[PDB]
Ligand binder design. Structure first.
Ligand code: HEM
Ligand code: HEM
Ligand SMILES: [Cl-]
Ligand code: NA
Ligand code: NA
Lengths: 712, 712
């Protein structure tokens, strides 16, 4: 059947805002995963996973009698989709079991790994999510093979449909760069927000860049893609050498033997894929990547034999049985055990990307230190493996269970504990009145609280107003945050805070993080009062103030809004139309299309625009909370045309007189153009809508203020 | 951005079961449109609509100074998408304001019509839906121009995103037949469920079949497509001749002047399209269809002039100024008024499809009767306009407001009023015990109640267990209903009814409609008991029994299930795979994916399959309510393969021994294959899920039993 997407392939897609509906979720509306997990017998789950490691199934025999390597790869792939640019991908939603990730070429035969785990998932049911189980299984694999992990947190709730992620524009799996849809431009610049070199790869091509077996060139792609997954050089070397301490690759025969990926396979395959016609199709005959490399002399035991081999041999370019480029140790004895035949041994082998760790000069120094000091290697790998597998879990408050590491890590964007009584309802009312009596305007108060709260993204649960990081580098100097106006607001609020905290007893005090949000609440209540409407905006205290020393300024760079339609802000010109960037922002903020619509219409008339731009400010009572944006936008008395100067800025003129009434961007006018958004704008721009508009605006304002409040 | 649909364009689409979520809806979850409409001042709205008729806007000037013809077309097009095959389309959800219908070629310039209504929509807000307003505007247009309508019902709730409808497979607007995606095969057979001749037309091509101007061949397409929209010869003549008593077509210059349809237009067009470069692009210069026809001497007044012209002249093939085929009266005077220039008059003109009403012998007889008996024409048109505009509104219990016709019409599938006390909980316990003491099995009770209730479709709200039409022609004869088994169950239930009603005083009695549903509830209770579970199934009395004479047997044919995955039933071999037909059926039953999953797993083990097929009966305890279907389906100890005899039937064998354990269809195994359906099956197949399965099953069973219960 022909669909709207066929007819109008460039129209905005709002369906990404309406995922994860109660409709698609088999659990009751009252289901609380954290409550279920907190009663899990995690020790009993880990004993079952431990037994599983050495219980081979004939439909997918265990290499060396041990599934550990397979399950470490499974858990690394689960986590390895993560991109810092948007926070999308990662292990935190168990998306490996859905399209497209269940059928990526780099996830070949991880369908078998997930199927091995169904008996344990079935036993423990809703008390352990697939998302937690994939990571736990990787931890138990490591533990069973003598590696001490840094710890584990539960709390990744299962999802029930694919995430809407931009994985790239290529129409061919693993397409080499330089195609019609190339993800590369300039001097090998990978397009944001991608963090993989080819469609369907986790990071890089194990042969080398676009198949060129050059370890030095490969090292470039490794460093670039790992940095885009939040890993520096030490972490990257620790992870790759740590992983490739275990197990083997699978390339026993030509790739033409391997059939359809799971999403393409026949219904009889019952959710599995990559059925191989090569000899037995599994075990000693397995084909996965097409490479055939076994790194260490003890693939089922933690060792420092990866670096011993990397540095102890010279390497020769060779071909797998599948015709893939790989390396073998020159002059070596057969010292590596065979996966199935206890009478066969093999020479040491390496991937191009393994040799990167020796032939890139910066990796070489780290790899030599790890070689000489394997206790340093073990500790870096444990820390990196925790970071990898938890990077998208959000604040430490979300971490469940008895194995949570007590060490607070800089990458967690940590929030200090609150040690003192919180302000009560009367205190909140006193502070709101003091804020409004200071002379801070509605526009200043709403703009500041919006700037602080709207860094949250639900993709990796980073950002939000908790921490008061808006006062620190680098948030205080982001262009979108209007640094000089922000500095003046924060100075006034800090004087209000000092006076209130000075006057208290019993150690009661208010954080600046709370006061910035409460001040924004006062701005919204004042705007409602300006409109002739008395409303109370909800407020929940208990935010704390993080220090500069507790803030990684480099990691905070990815949270900078370079597009924020809710402030009519675009840092520069992009490929992507501004309205597409608005819907992307609404998705990160976890907003529905109705929530996005009411929030944007209200922010316009409150003065939230960066630079006090008039664009979309369709009111003659700025700083009053009215539905004026919608009533004026939908007024057929006004005709719109793109400006001569700028095709992305529109003039609204009286249709009769030609008088200039308004100007607006694409972000403003899309609400009068897109057939689904216009239907929403009509509800809010109706004569009966003033009370509904205020209520809905207050609701979505409060939602945004609370996005990072996992402490509640 | 490459999507899962791009990679796997044949995988099942579950998103059609999760549309119309609370997420996309701007109204509160408690919003009750019926209650809002009941408070509407309908008299005030109709005064506003009467005023609008002659209030010309310069951006789309009114023909003859009266918008009535444009609005009648707008309302006819709102209703005219309806198909009897699936009940999809029609006016009942206001889908003309969304993609794709807002942009169909046949809906060109109806964007202008809807925009003229925005001020009235704005003024009355949520108290009148767009869906109600489009039809009410059509009524007022007719009343304004002298035609007395049969009545009007409110209660069409607005919807907030496009309906998932198969409109055809063509990838070109208006493609003529015989293309690579032809909707025609054999002797001009239109594929079910389509009810138009070309992609983006309402019914037929006004020039003639595939543009061939043969009124006789055109009559064939008119008959077929109108029959597929529930209209017979009399209704079809009345509707076309009635409509074309008013207004005019628009083709003042070449179609090449007309730009992008609304969904393709620039953002500055603010939701309008078909902007024309021809002269002023509007009014006298309007281009809509490309035809230039005005039917009557008084296009803004009800007249008998359509049939006077049709019969009173001989017709000559000619071309509009756009190059379209149409017909001019041989030797006629210039009697037709111009829409704008009082100094111009025109010869009578007709479309090919108008001449059909004369040159098709069966239409000719009706047209002549209407010409000779104008009162018969007026009454037929009024009744057909009502039916057209209310055909998808469902039972009369949904009809709101003060203009609802009292007359009960056969096409409404009327239910008699209940005039007696209903059974209470004590009676329901007594009737269930009698049902279970009769010897009727779980399989018989569940199968009969499923057969009765599952005819419902939310597309046009036809069907369901109310009326006990399963005992009448043609439902009692449907293969899916197992006529011989059905007859035996009904005979036993009618004997229980007779004995219960015979023992009552005070006029209390139970309908067979109620007893069938209650007996099915007893079956489910007995099944739960068979599984060691104490369960009560909710039951709401108040169904009444319709007569054979209240049941149009030809209209009832389109509800016949030729595919019902819930009974593992396929009447023959279709081009669409069985699992796509299962999701289509779930959508018509208003089920979510979780609901569809739990229902199907439960029905399989209760013995609801047609013919007692073993396909999908993955239990050793049939007629016990357990999650066995899921636990056995997900057992990796079983391997599945298609049979030699039948690629659509699968054998489940022990992996280790090769012993046959089970057989299943595509409908069974899709729950083990589709990545999202398998995630749902896993929840219900987990060790902690038996009580959840039972309670979810009872909830969705009750939901299906109540689908048509608008009396509640
Ligand atoms: C440049 C980065 C990396 C590349 C190109 C890479 C490439 C590969 C390839 C091609 C395979 C063979 C797949 C097969 O045929 O079965 C593999 C296996 C594996 N990788 Fe990596 N890898 C990378 C990083 C990592 C990391 C970060 C980890 C975990 C910390 C990891 C752990 C493993 C394990 C345990 C296996 C063995 C699977 C088995 O025994 O079945 N890899 N890798
Ligand atoms: C065989 C069925 C039909 C055909 C092929 C057909 C075709 C057309 C076409 C081509 C136009 C001109 C559109 C334009 O250029 O503006 C039109 C106009 C119209 N049709 Fe029909 N029609 C049919 C049935 C109906 C029915 C059932 C109704 C209503 C009961 C109706 C009411 C109208 C009206 C009122 C207009 C005039 C619009 C105006 O004044 O702007 N038609 N029709
Ligand atoms: Cl639940
Ligand atoms: Na993420
Ligand atoms: Na419908």
């Amino acid at each position: 059947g022909t669909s709207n997407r066929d007819w109008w392939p460039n129209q905005l897609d709002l369906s990404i805002l309406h995922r994860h509906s109660s409709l698609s979720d088999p659990m009751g509306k009252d289901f609380n995963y954290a409550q279920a997990f907190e009663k899990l017998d995690l020790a009993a789950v880990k004993r079952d996973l431990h037994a599983l490691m050495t219980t081979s199934q004939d439909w997918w025999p265990a290499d060396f009698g041990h599934y550990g390597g397979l399950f470490i790869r499974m858990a690394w792939h689960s986590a390895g989709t993560y991109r810092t640019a948007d926070g999308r991908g990662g292990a935190g939603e168990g998306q490996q079991r859905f399209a497209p990730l269940n059928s990526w070429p780099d996830n070949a035969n991880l369908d078998k790994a997930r199927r091995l785990l169904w008996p344990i998932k079935q036993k423990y049911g809703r008390a352990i999510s697939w998302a937690d189980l994939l990571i736990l299984t990787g931890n138990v694999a490591l533990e069973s093979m003598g590696f001490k992990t840094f710890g584990f947190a539960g709390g990744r709730a299962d999802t029930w449909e694919p995430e809407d992620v931009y994985w790239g524009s290529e129409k061919i799996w693993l397409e080499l760069s330089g195609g019609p849809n190339s993800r590369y431009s300039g001097d090998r610049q990978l397009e944001n927000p991608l963090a993989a070199v080819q469609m369907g790869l986790i990071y890089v091509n194990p042969e080398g860049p676009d198949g060129n077996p050059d370890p030095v060139a490969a090292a470039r792609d490794i460093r670039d893609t790992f940095a885009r997954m939040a890993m520096n050089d030490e972490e990257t070397v620790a992870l790759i050498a740590g992983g490739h301490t275990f197990g083997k690759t699978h390339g026993a025969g030509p790739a033409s033997n391997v059939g359809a990926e799971p999403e393409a396979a026949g219904i009889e395959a019952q959710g599995l894929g990559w059925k191989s016609a090569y000899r037995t199709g599994k075990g000693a005959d397995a084909i996965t990547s097409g490479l055939e490399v076994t790194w260490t002399t003890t693939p089922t035991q933690w060792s420092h034999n990866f670096f011993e081999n990397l540095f102890g041999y010279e390497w020769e370019l060779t071909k797998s049985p599948a015709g893939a480029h790989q390396w073998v140790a020159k002059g070596a004895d057969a010292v590596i055990p065979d996966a199935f035949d206890p009478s066969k041994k093999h020479r040491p082998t390496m991937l191009t990307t393994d040799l990167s760790l020796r032939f890139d000069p910066a990796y070489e120094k780290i790899s030599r230190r790890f070689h000489e000091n394997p206790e340093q290697f073990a500790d870096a790998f444990a820390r990196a493996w925790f970071k990898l597998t938890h990077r998208d879990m959000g604040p430490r408050a979300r971490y469940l269970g008895p194995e949570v590491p007590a060490e607070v890590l800089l990458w967690q964007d940590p929030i200090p504990a609150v040690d003192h009584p919180l302000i009560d309802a009367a205190d909140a009312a006193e502070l709101k009145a003091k804020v409004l009596a200071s002379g801070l305007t509605v526009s200043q108060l709403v703009s500041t609280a919006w700037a602080a709260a709207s860094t949250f993204r639900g993709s990796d649960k980073r950002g939000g107003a908790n921490g008061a990081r808006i006062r620190l580098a680098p948030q205080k100097d982001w262009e979108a945050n209007q640094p000089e106006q922000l500095a003046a607001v924060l100075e006034t609020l800090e004087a209000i805070r000092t006076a209130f905290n000075g006057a208290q007893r019993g150690g009661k005090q208010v954080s600046l993080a709370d006061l910035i949000v409460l001040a924004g609440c006062a701005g919204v209540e004042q705007a409602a009062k300006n409109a002739g409407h008395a409303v109370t905006v909800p407020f929940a205290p208990g935010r704390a103030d993080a220090s500069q020393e507790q803030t990684d300024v480099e990691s905070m760079a990815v949270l900078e809004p370079v597009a924020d339609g809710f402030r009519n802000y675009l840092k520069g010109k992009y490929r992507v139309p501004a309205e597409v960037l608005l819907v992307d922002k609404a998705q990160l903020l976890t907003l529905s299309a109705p929530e996005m619509t009411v929030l944007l219409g209200g922010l316009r008339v409150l003065g939230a625009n960066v630079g006090q731009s008039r664009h979309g400010v369709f009111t003659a009572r700025e700083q009053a909370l009215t539905n004026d944006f919608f009533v004026n936008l939908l007024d057929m008395g006004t005709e719109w045309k793109p400006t001569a100067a700028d095709a992305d800025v529109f003039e609204g003129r009286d249709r009769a007189t030609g008088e200039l009434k308004w100007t607006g961007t694409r972000v403003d006018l899309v609400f009068g153009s897109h057939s689904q958004l216009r239907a929403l704008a009509e509800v809010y721009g109706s004569a009966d809508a003033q009370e509904k508009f205020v209520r809905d605006f207050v609701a979505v304002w409060n939602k945004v203020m609370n996005l990072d409040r996992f402490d509640l």
